[PDB]
Design an enzyme around this catalytic site. Sequence first.
Site, PDB file in Angstrom:
ATOM      1  N   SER A  62       8.322  -0.141   3.941  1.00  0.00           N
ATOM      2  CA  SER A  62       7.074   0.155   3.239  1.00  0.00           C
ATOM      3  C   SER A  62       6.272  -1.080   2.823  1.00  0.00           C
ATOM      4  O   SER A  62       5.116  -0.932   2.394  1.00  0.00           O
ATOM      5  CB  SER A  62       7.335   1.002   2.058  1.00  0.00           C
ATOM      6  OG  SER A  62       7.753   2.285   2.500  1.00  0.00           O
ATOM      7  N   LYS A  65       2.924  -0.964   4.268  1.00  0.00           N
ATOM      8  CA  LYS A  65       1.776  -0.296   3.640  1.00  0.00           C
ATOM      9  C   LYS A  65       0.730  -1.329   3.176  1.00  0.00           C
ATOM     10  O   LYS A  65      -0.443  -0.950   3.031  1.00  0.00           O
ATOM     11  CB  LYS A  65       2.249   0.614   2.504  1.00  0.00           C
ATOM     12  CG  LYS A  65       3.094   1.803   2.941  1.00  0.00           C
ATOM     13  CD  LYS A  65       3.750   2.498   1.787  1.00  0.00           C
ATOM     14  CE  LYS A  65       4.413   3.813   2.132  1.00  0.00           C
ATOM     15  NZ  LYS A  65       5.532   3.734   3.112  1.00  0.00           N
ATOM     16  N   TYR A 149       4.867   9.080  -4.673  1.00  0.00           N
ATOM     17  CA  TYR A 149       4.968   8.091  -3.630  1.00  0.00           C
ATOM     18  C   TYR A 149       5.238   8.789  -2.285  1.00  0.00           C
ATOM     19  O   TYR A 149       6.108   9.671  -2.178  1.00  0.00           O
ATOM     20  CB  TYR A 149       6.028   7.072  -4.052  1.00  0.00           C
ATOM     21  CG  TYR A 149       6.224   5.969  -3.045  1.00  0.00           C
ATOM     22  CD1 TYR A 149       5.243   5.008  -2.843  1.00  0.00           C
ATOM     23  CD2 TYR A 149       7.377   5.890  -2.282  1.00  0.00           C
ATOM     24  CE1 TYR A 149       5.407   3.987  -1.919  1.00  0.00           C
ATOM     25  CE2 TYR A 149       7.575   4.856  -1.371  1.00  0.00           C
ATOM     26  CZ  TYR A 149       6.579   3.918  -1.171  1.00  0.00           C
ATOM     27  OH  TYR A 149       6.781   2.896  -0.290  1.00  0.00           O
ATOM     28  N   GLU A 271       1.070  -2.969  -5.739  1.00  0.00           N
ATOM     29  CA  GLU A 271       1.323  -2.483  -7.078  1.00  0.00           C
ATOM     30  C   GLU A 271       1.326  -3.719  -7.970  1.00  0.00           C
ATOM     31  O   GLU A 271       1.989  -4.705  -7.633  1.00  0.00           O
ATOM     32  CB  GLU A 271       2.653  -1.702  -7.120  1.00  0.00           C
ATOM     33  CG  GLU A 271       2.615  -0.418  -6.307  1.00  0.00           C
ATOM     34  CD  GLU A 271       3.953   0.313  -6.105  1.00  0.00           C
ATOM     35  OE1 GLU A 271       4.919   0.094  -6.906  1.00  0.00           O
ATOM     36  OE2 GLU A 271       4.052   1.025  -5.101  1.00  0.00           O
ATOM     37  N   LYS A 314       5.409  -5.333  -3.587  1.00  0.00           N
ATOM     38  CA  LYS A 314       5.743  -4.147  -2.857  1.00  0.00           C
ATOM     39  C   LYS A 314       7.195  -4.259  -2.386  1.00  0.00           C
ATOM     40  O   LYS A 314       7.598  -5.296  -1.863  1.00  0.00           O
ATOM     41  CB  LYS A 314       4.844  -3.989  -1.616  1.00  0.00           C
ATOM     42  CG  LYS A 314       4.963  -2.622  -0.955  1.00  0.00           C
ATOM     43  CD  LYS A 314       4.493  -1.494  -1.856  1.00  0.00           C
ATOM     44  CE  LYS A 314       4.790  -0.090  -1.346  1.00  0.00           C
ATOM     45  NZ  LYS A 314       6.223   0.246  -1.422  1.00  0.00           N
ATOM     46  N   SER A 317      11.878  -0.477   2.475  1.00  0.00           N
ATOM     47  CA  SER A 317      13.250  -0.144   2.927  1.00  0.00           C
ATOM     48  C   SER A 317      13.162   0.704   4.205  1.00  0.00           C
ATOM     49  O   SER A 317      12.248   1.542   4.397  1.00  0.00           O
ATOM     50  CB  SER A 317      13.965   0.657   1.855  1.00  0.00           C
ATOM     51  OG  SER A 317      14.159  -0.070   0.667  1.00  0.00           O
TER      52      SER A 317
END
Length: 367
Positions: A62, A65, A149, A271, A314, A317
């Site tokens: 991720s 992203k 999420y 984030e 961030k 996994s």
Amino acid sequence: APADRLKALVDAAVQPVMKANDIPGLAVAISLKGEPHYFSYGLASKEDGRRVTPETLFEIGSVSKTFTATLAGYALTQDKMRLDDRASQHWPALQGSRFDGISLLDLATYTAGGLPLQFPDSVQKDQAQIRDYYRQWQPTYAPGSQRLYSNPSIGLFGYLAARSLGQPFERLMEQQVFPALGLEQTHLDVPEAALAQYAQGYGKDDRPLRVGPGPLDAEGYGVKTSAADLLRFVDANLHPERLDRPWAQALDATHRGYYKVGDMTQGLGWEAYDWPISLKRLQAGNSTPMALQPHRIARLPAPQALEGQRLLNKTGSTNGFGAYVAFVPGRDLGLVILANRNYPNAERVKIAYAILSGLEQQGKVPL
Ligand SMILES: *[B]([O])([O])C1=[C][C]=[C]C(/[C]=[C]/C([O])=O)=[C]1
């Protein structure tokens, strides 16, 4: 030099964690005022004793992203899409569904109304099954009310960004994004010539695992990269103005916060937290409940620029791999931790915090 203390600091942060989580291999890359420092530990592959290096390719899950968000940034700043666009405006096959009433921003920030963490098992990597999944989808929550999420959420964001640009997602990433960012060891599909560098992933009982195909895999979790390349991406995020204007603007677009959950401000992909912050609080922002449970959002009067005294991060996994990236603009500090086991987020944060906090304490005035 703050660099002089790094080796002892990083070994102390890393090695106990590797031992306690039986991590076969792990690469750290740190940027201190734009200068890279690399620390490599263990094995990329146990079967053939290949050592981790800064050029070893890991699945970053991720963390992908943030790359997806960057492509969306580029679409936004080329006026191909706007964050308040209806999702179905960019994919006519969705007109008539719930995606008529859901914004691109909702998809990007996981607030479309409870799109799940992952697509159901039954959805295969196929345009028509993906289309049909979103056409039949019914919401759990009102849009803009709850963060859950979600790979299908931000995955559709990335897919729609690509559609607004008139080209396949994978092509845009491979032919425009990666080259714009100067990344030559970064892949959605690891080519012939680079397969030798692809670490093996390890799961429970040391089952060897590399990520398999899945719907919107490229958009949500499909990047393989080296610690050295991911640090180049982190450095581009620390100093976007060093890129050509279109790409500088695309990165800046990902550094804007839309709402808060506890201590965490949600950006596009990224984030963010105030810096300094306590270890316990950074761990809680990156907790299993944050990833798996719905949370009420505190919406911001206006999008907040994620700059100055903040930490952006961030986790990522896959079945075989665990990645974490963070940067602190007001310290000009970048950090990448890539491993070939999916080990707990809390432990990743423990490593990163030891490093960030250790560097923080050298910059104090004696007595
Ligand atoms: B991240 O990493 O966080 C994510 C989310 C969701 C989903 C996914 C997938 C994975 C595999 O399969 O590998 C990821």
